[PDB]
Amino acid sequence: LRIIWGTNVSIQECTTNFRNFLMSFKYKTDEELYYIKQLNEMRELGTSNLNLDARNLLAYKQTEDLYHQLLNYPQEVISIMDQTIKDCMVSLIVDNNLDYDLDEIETKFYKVRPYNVGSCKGMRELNPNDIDKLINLKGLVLRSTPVIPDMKVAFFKCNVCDHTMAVEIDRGVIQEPARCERIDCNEPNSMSLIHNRCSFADKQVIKLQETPDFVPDGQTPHSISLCVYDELVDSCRAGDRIEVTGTFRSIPIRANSRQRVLKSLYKTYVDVVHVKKVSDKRLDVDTSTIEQELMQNKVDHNEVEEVRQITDQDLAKIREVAAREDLYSLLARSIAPSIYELEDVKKGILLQLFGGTNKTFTKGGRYRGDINILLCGDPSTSKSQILQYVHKITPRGVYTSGKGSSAVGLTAYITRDVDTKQLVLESGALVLSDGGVCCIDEFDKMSDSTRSVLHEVMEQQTISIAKAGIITTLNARSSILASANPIGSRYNPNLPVTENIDLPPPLLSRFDLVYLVLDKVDEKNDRELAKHLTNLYLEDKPEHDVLPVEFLTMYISYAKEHIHPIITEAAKTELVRAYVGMRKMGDSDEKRITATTRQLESMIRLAEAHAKMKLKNVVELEDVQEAVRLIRSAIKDYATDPKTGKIDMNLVQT
Amino acid sequence: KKFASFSLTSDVEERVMELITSGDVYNRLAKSIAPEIYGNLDVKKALLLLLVGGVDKRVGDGMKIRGDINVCLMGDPGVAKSQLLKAICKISPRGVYTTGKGSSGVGLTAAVMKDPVTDEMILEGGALVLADNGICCIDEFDKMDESDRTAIHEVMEQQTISISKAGINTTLNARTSILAAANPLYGRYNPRLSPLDNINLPAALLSRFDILFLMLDIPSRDDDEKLAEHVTYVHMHNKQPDLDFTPVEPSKMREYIAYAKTKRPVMSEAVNDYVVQAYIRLRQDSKREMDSKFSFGQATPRTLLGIIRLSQALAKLRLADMVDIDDVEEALRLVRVSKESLYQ
Ligand SMILES: Nc1ncnc2c1ncn2[C@@H]1O[C@H](COP(=O)(O)OP(=O)(O)O)[C@@H](O)[C@H]1O
Ligand SMILES: Nc1ncnc2c1ncn2[C@@H]1O[C@H](COP(=O)(O)OP(=O)(O)O)[C@@H](O)[C@H]1O
Ligand SMILES: [Mg+2]
Ligand SMILES: [Mg+2]
Ligand SMILES: [Zn+2]
């Protein structure tokens, strides 16, 4: 009936349609009223924000137009939606006469957060006509400014009679009174602004490294600015992978701080309304690293969830899958189905993903269960696909190369902000990966200067800085997954291991597992691999007893969250016995990787990981035995001569 | 014209249909690449296949397999490698040409600078980013620095460049093909030394090429006559000497390649059986040669992937929806031709 100038929105039609959709819609559990229960749970718990999947609107017939209205005119539609939600809430509470205490709901505020806007084409592909629309983005957080106070109400005082006023901001402008509003006092221009008596809101700016799905020819990465307000501040940390929904904005900027002249070319940014921090293609963040942030989220009444929710049926399925007697082989085979065999490599990858148990001593002291692995072997094997897959499955991590890095580029640096024109501190690769896995390729090309900084990271999971202006110690709780190629052309089995890898022998002892990926010619294995690889081109799309990636991630995340194994004396005896065996066995030098205490630590970590898998809380003899077997098999001591340190190509099994 | 902007229409369709009707598309296109250079036919076929490319496959779970073909030429001085490099760079719509130490550091990859127009920071792409979805030609491949070699290594590996330095932590897109040229370590090739001792590059880097050609200069009173006749005729006039063959101009070649790039042939079962048998036989044979220290590199799964890519490229050039045995025949034929210079 009565539309709004500039738009086509009618308030009455929109509110009626939204109410009807709220009161009649089911997910077609799929036959029950979907949103009635969500509102009921909201009021039982007292939450104030409703997350609206905009895709749910395209299902109902009425709201096939409200979808486009929301995508085109978010400003009016969101306010209409909030008011309609409050009205529906009062109707629900009163129409059934539950409890006469309804003042709180009638006084508080509500809000709606769209979170499934359609697929976009990237920030840089937008045009001027797309300003003030609803869009979504993917990217990586880099920096965040401190909280900015943003005034909403100004407090004036009269300098002759103490009369005090209050003025509310109006589209970003304050109207200062030109005369005291008293009859006794009417002095003109006598009102002064007391800043400390004003009311301020919360504001912050985030720097985002966008990761669009489609990339044109010759396009390099860039950065974007995001504005978050009120309860969403401090909800993102550098290194987080996020999905964001917001409005596309523009604004002119002043040329200098003295004049009030503006520039014709505008500056673009995004106003955020919802942030998604979870996915079904990767593991959930390690909660042992965000202990205080969850508490702060609870204190701040922000409804962003860090970990995915679990249904009862999902937990039941998890238990049944964990109850079978082929669990280890099945889980290993699930990892990277497009990679053939490599049973022990995949077992090591799975154990690294699970991780060991973190001890935290009262009165100070920290042990961590991060597991480090080095991959050495013939150049043409599939040891970089592994790094790619592990990078894409993990929640945090950076994929670096040894020769294309630097000591400063991995730790921290200072840069001048192009907007504020001041100097700020940024993070390096190893701190951006805290709580995740850092993949290093061609580890043997890294300079000694560059390699120097890995010692502290792998020996205390921290880094120290002594630079101009900054002196502090940082957390580096990240796992290392490296790879190396042999000296020359191929791994020569007529020489010791230390004559094939271009690293100091002492360095090779700090890893938990070392793999020798050898390539042997056997017609059966060649036939198998060739058939496996040629089956992938039978049809234009992939179709390859394997669990789906979503269930695998859910299972591993649940196991990491909810199981914490502990070692027993039966395991202690075997641990000490095996360590003494390794130390004694092999006892004319630099022929083999000498055993050290790091090996005992590695056995502890691997046994804890094996116990943590399969939902056990106690480490036992089988766990330690499997850990020792895996450590021995990775370096394949079975085919090695204890005296000369050579390898027999006939005793090695594909 | 860019390939992505392709579109069928009466005008383009008539020219294309004429080209197919004339028959012998493969050799006719192959012989038109740098027609002022005598001989060098199989290298030209490999270059044409590098122009066309293979098929990119999305395997699922985020895994990725390239479809671009990398070719390396390495031979004695005065064999016209640079002419072929430059001609290929000129034919390609997004081609770039580089030579050794003239381009280094941020000349490759990208650097950080400030935009004059806008007040924001940006990255300017180097040689490897300017030729994205094109051909990157590298001359004097053996005289480069280690950092450039590592960058090329990664680009051939996974079509990306990772940088972690002061003020930059990002990953670039490098969907480009590599065409390199190199020289033996002592000038001319020395048949008294192992093949891996005649070159300065690591063996793995050489193994990372689909096709690796050896071009030696063995004097012969017969072929020298033909080469001299060709060159001196080319200098007397401005054209090539053959009259029974007409070369196709670059625009028509570009049009036909753009049309061919829209196809995506698929693997049947008999072709797969043939491929597995050939792979087994070749892999078994190569080990004995490499034990005698007479092989640039032992066969590995990358050889099988290169064979598959070349078969796909030939199928695409034929304008067919399926692959046949003859395509795999030609792929193996070329991969065998790659090394006659080492058996004379
Ligand atoms: N076991 C395997 N399973 C699947 N593909 C393989 C396997 N072994 C080799 N390949 C193929 O060979 C290539 C190996 O190269 P790549 O893994 O990049 O080398 P590296 O990782 O050793 O640097 C891949 O393209 C892959 O398709
Ligand atoms: N097969 C050939 N046909 C015609 N000209 C040739 C041939 N081989 C060499 N040349 C001539 O000799 C010169 C070789 O120089 P260049 O192109 O740099 O090759 P290279 O770098 O291999 O020496 C060129 O100018 C070219 O004209
Ligand atoms: Mg690789
Ligand atoms: Mg030259
Ligand atoms: Zn007053």
Short mmCIF file of C-alpha atoms and ligand atoms in Angstrom, two decimals, chain B residues 81-82 139-140, ligand 4:
data_model
loop_
_atom_site.label_atom_id
_atom_site.label_comp_id
_atom_site.label_asym_id
_atom_site.label_seq_id
_atom_site.Cartn_x
_atom_site.Cartn_y
_atom_site.Cartn_z
CA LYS B 81 66.69 -22.56 -29.15
CA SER B 82 66.22 -18.83 -28.53
CA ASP B 139 66.33 -18.48 -21.49
CA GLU B 140 69.70 -19.43 -20.01
MG MG C 4 70.32 -18.56 -27.11
#
